Amino acid sequence: RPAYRDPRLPVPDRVDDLMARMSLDDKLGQMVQVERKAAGPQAVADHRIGSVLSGGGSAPEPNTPQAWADMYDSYQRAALSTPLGIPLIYGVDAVHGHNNVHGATIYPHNIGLGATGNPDLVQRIGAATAEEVAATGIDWSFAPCVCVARDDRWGRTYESFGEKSENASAMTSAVTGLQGEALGATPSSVMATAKHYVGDGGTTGGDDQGNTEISEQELREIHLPPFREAIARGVGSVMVSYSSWNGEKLHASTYLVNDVLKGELGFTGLVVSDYDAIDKLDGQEDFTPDEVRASVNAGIDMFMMSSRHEKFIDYLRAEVEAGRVPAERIDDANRRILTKKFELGLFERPFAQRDLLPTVGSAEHRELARQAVRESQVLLRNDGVLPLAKDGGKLFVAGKNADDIGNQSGGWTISWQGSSGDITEGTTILEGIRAAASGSEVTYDRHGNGVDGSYRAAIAVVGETPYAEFEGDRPGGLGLDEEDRATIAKLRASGVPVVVVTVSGRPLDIAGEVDGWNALLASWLPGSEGQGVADVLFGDHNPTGKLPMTWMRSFDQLPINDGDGQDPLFPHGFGLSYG
Numbered sequence: 399r400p401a402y403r404d405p406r407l408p409v410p411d412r413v414d415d416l417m418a419r420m421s422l423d424d425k426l427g428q429m430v431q432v433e434r435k436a437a438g439p440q441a442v443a444d445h446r447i448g449s450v451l452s453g454g455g456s457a458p459e460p461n462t463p464q465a466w467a468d469m470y471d472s473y474q475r476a477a478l479s480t481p482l483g484i485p486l487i488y489g490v491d492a493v494h495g496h497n498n499v500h501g502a503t504i505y506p507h508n509i510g511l512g513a514t515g516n517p518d519l520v521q522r523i524g525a526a527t528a529e530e531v532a533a534t535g536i537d538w539s540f541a542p543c544v545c546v547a548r549d550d551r552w553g554r555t556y557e558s559f560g561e562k563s564e565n566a567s568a569m570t571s572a573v574t575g576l577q578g579e580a581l582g583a584t585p586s587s588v589m590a591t592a593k594h595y596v597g598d599g600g601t602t603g604g605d606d607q608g609n610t611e612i613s614e615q616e617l618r619e620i621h622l623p624p625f626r627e628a629i630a631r632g633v634g635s636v637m638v639s640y641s642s643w644n645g646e647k648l649h650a651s652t653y654l655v656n657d658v659l660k661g662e663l664g665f666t667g668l669v670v671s672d673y674d675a676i677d678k679l680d681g682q683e684d685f686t687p688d689e690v691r692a693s694v695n696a697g698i699d700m701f702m703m704s705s706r707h708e709k710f711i712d713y714l715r716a717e718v719e720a721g722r723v724p725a726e727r728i729d730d731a732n733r734r735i736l737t738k739k740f741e742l743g744l745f746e747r748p749f750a751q752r753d754l755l756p757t758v759g760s761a762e763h764r765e766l767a768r769q770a771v772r773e774s775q776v777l778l779r780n781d782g783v784l785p786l787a788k789d790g791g792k793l794f795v796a797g798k799n800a801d802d803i804g805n806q807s808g809g810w811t812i813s814w815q816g817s818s819g820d821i822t823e824g825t826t827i828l829e830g831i832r833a834a835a836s837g838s839e840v841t842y843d844r845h846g847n848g849v850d851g852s853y854r855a856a857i858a859v860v861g862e863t864p865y866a867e868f869e870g871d872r873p874g875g876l877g878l879d880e881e882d883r884a885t886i887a888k889l890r891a892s893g894v895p896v897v898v899v900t901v902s903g904r905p906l907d908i909a910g911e912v913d914g915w916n917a918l919l920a921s922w923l924p925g926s927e928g929q930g931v932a933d934v935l936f937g938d939h940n941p942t943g944k945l946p947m948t949w950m951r952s953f954d955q956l957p958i959n960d961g962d963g964q965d966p967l968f969p970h971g972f973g974l975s976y977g
């Protein structure tokens with residue numbers, strides 16, 4: 399009988415009726431998103447908490463798609479038992495597939511997706527990702543990063559679709575895939591998150607969580623446009639950045655968050671903080687009442703925290719009681735959060751859609767991922783060695799990234815940082831090479847040992863190991879490590895033609911060596927379907943990818959970006975094909 403329980407009522411009328419019935423404590427609870435390790439289902443319900451997230455690597459046991467759905471439903475049952483029965487919204491980083499879930503499809507990271515120049519493909523990946531997430535019940539992915547990465551030293555360069563605002567703006571089609579045209583319209587609708595607002599790709603030195611020291615014009619012309627496009631597509635959520643703009647923390651920027659994002663850009667959705675982001679406002683651990691006040695009054699609606707939910711609620715209650723946070727600010731945050739819960743259909747269909755569990759890691763989704771692997775490959779040098787024949791002559795394969803699911807997936811794969819090894823279901827690049835050259839003997843040695851002049855070609859799959867966020871900052875350099883250079887030198891010493899394949903999250907500093915390589919193929923972080931690399935190597939896919947970042951002649955040029963007058967090794971948009 400309460401109007402908010404009427405599923406035929408317009409959403410704003412349902413929101414009005416529910417909020418009319420809420421105590422201040424109910425409203426404070428809705429503004430909390432707590433990490434699952436800090437609060438089980440009962441505690442989430444006891445505090446009337448609005449949201450739970452899994453941080454990177456935060457899986458139930460066992461890590462299976464069914465166990466995630468069970469975990470989600472367990473939290474939801476408790477939330478539904480409260481006096482108002484406001485359903486929980488659950489968030490997760492599903493940033494290249496449902497990447498915390500073992501056996502989920504792992505798509506190329508954003509930088510390779512930007513290299514495809516194919517927004518329709520990115521949209522299809524958003525839709526397939528949303529299906530695999532909705533199978534586990536989770537309602538909300540912290541994706542896409544619409545960050546415009548301007549300094550390759552940044553540990554999140556690979557989460558960026560490219561260095562040009564055009565790149566990221568075009569790829570906000572990921573939002574349309576994840577959400578559908580209308581949030582909640584289909585059962586696999588999953589709320590998307592434009593992140594991180596704003597300027598995370600512009601920090602000085604590419605330092606993660608750093609300071610973006612640029613004019614308002616530069617901020618608006620380079621970093622803002624992808625947010626505008628995501629909003630035009632109906633993005634349900636925007637996540638604020640840890641970084642600063644001209645020394646002002648984004649999480650305290652009333653101007654950028656309230657005045658520009660909510661006001662000028664007219665964003666009507668849910669503004670969420672980054673993880674324990676208010677804690678970092680004063681540079682000291684934990685959050686103070688001052689940090690709560692500053693960030694709530696900046697206009698943020700929901701606060702993502704690793705623990706201390708009861709302390710957050712107590713602090714915010716006191717701020718509201720004292721009038722330092724106006725009552726309308728709490729109501730604005732609740733109207734935005736509850737609206738998305740109603741739009742997502744959570745008051746009608748709160749539980750995991752287990753009919754979708756068979757799609758998780760399904761062949762059709764892996765075929766889509768393989769197509770993204772193919773199109774993300776960027777051919778940068780080729781003297782004729784590529785494409786390799788399927789003629790039967792012996793091939794040699796080497797490199798620490800040749801036969802490693804985890805290395806080819808990079809960060810945010812099962813764990814937060816990612817890791818090396820066979821960490822989820824997929825096909826390695828070496829396995830794709832063996833299958834492409836199905837009539838050929840294929841010798842593999844990580845370090846190139848055993849290669850000789852009897853081989854018709856040697857393939858060295860080198861580059862980075864997995865990282866995420868600040869752990870991936872590289873102020874010290876981006877050259878190949880000593881193993882990669884030793885292995886390539888061993889292969890070149892055989893006199894055999896050498897194909898170098900970079901598995902990396904960004905351009906690497908290779909200008910001093912590249913002239914010795916018969917071919918160079920940039921593969922980025924292709925994900926679980928490594929066979930798409932062999933598709934290009936053997937000419938099944940004539941390379942179509944183009945560089946989404948300008949490729950340095952020297953580490954000393956960073957930051958290097960299209961139009962800055964510097965002379966690059968390869969310019970933005972560069973990519974060879976077979977001719």
Ligand SMILES: OC[C@@H](O)[C@@H](O)[C@H](O)[C@@H](O)CO
Binds near residue numbers: 453454491540593814
């Ligand atoms: O892109 C930011 C991401 O959403 C982050 O907030 C994660 O949720 C957290 O780091 C998980 O450990």
Ligand SMILES: [Mg+2]
Binds near residue numbers: 525526757762763
């Ligand atoms: Mg599907």
Ligand SMILES: [Mg+2]
Binds near residue numbers: 532535748749750
């Ligand atoms: Mg759901």
Ligand SMILES: [Mg+2]
Binds near residue numbers: 605606868871
């Ligand atoms: Mg750093």
Ligand SMILES: [Mg+2]
Binds near residue numbers: 676680686
């Ligand atoms: Mg603090």
Ligand SMILES: [Mg+2]
Binds near residue numbers: 803822823824826
């Ligand atoms: Mg495998």
Ligand SMILES: [Mg+2]
Binds near residue numbers: 550561958960
């Ligand atoms: Mg650049």
